[PDB]
Specification:
The structure is a homodimer. Chain A is mainly β. In chain A, 11% of the residues lie in helices and 43% in strands. Chain A has a single domain, classed as Cystine-knot cytokines (Cystine Knot Cytokines, subunit B), CATH 2.10.90. The PDB classes it as cytokine, signaling protein.
């Protein structure tokens, strides 16, 4: 907004040197979280109790308390087809690969 | 280290204007997470798959990818004794009040 929210993140496995073993997908949208977490953190950013308290304390003490941080709070899996160290073909569901929700923590 | 890790955070409820309703505890150590998350993120920072991939991508693309962020990854509850809006005394376990573990996310 520039407040904490989800944004695209296009990951190309060729770029990070993994294209020799990952067969599919070579590229995928992993998304990302980015944006400021205001003090105090409103309910729309789904803070934990701890995050809310830290953000309120930062209002009253801006120089000794760090802001809470915009991070993934819900993630989902993708299936990847790849070659293992023995060149066996493996199909596996990898957890926590795609950001589905962001929040201040 | 200054790498991502847990640090103290002394919360005084009197300071944030909640001392009129919270009876106990008036102050508690909530802790906090703070410190850099290196690229790529090592196993010691307990990254998710997504956090690891984002951090590796940032190595190869430092200007378009944000660093992963040091946040609470495990939290615990505290019991609070307080007065509600009707001045009834309530004893309740509040979740997510104390940081117990930090990681890059």
């Amino acid at each position: 907004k520039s407040s904490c929210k989800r944004h695209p993140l296009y990951v190309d496995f060729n770029l990070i040197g993994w294209g020799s073993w990952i067969i599919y997908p070579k590229q995928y949208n992993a998304y990302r979280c980015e944006g400021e977490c205001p003090n105090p953190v409103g309910e729309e950013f789904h803070p934990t109790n701890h995050a809310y308290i830290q953000s309120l304390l930062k209002r009253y003490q801006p120089h000794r308390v760090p802001s809470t941080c915009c991070v993934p709070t819900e993630l989902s899996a993708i299936s990847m087809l790849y070659l293992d160290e023995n060149e066996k073909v493996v199909l596996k569901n990898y957890q926590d690969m795609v950001v589905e929700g962001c929040g201040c923590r």
